[PDB]
Amino acid sequence: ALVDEVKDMEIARLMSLGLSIEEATEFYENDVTYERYLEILKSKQKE
After folding, report:
1. Which of the two ends of the chain, N or C, has the fewest CB atoms closer than 10 A to its terminal CB?
2. Is 16 left (phi over 0), alpha (psi -120 to 50) or beta?
3. Which ranges of the chain would DSSP assign to H, the alpha helix?
4. 47 neighbors 29 (Cβ within 8 angstroms)
5. Which residues are CB-neighbours of 34 under 8 A, at least 6 positions away?
C-alpha cells in the first residue's frame, strides 16, 4: 500500500515502543517497516 495512512499507522507503532516524533518517522522508514526495527533497537539501548 502507498497511501499516507500506511506511514501514519507505522509511525503510531513507534509511539507504542517509545520513540521521537518527526525523527522517529524518518528512522522507522530508514531501519525498515516496524517488526524488523523493533528487533534491531532491542539489540541496541542497554540498561
Report:
1. C
2. alpha
3. 4-17, 22-31, 35-43
4. no
5. 10, 13, 28
What the block records as the C-alpha cell of 36 is 524488523
CATH code of 1-47, in short, is 1.10.8.10
**Cα–Cα distance for residue pair 35/13, rounded to 1 Å:** 9
SS3 category, 43: helix
Chain centre distance of CA 19: 8
Residues 6+ apart with CB under 8 A from 44: none
Q: What's the chain's length in residues?
A: 47
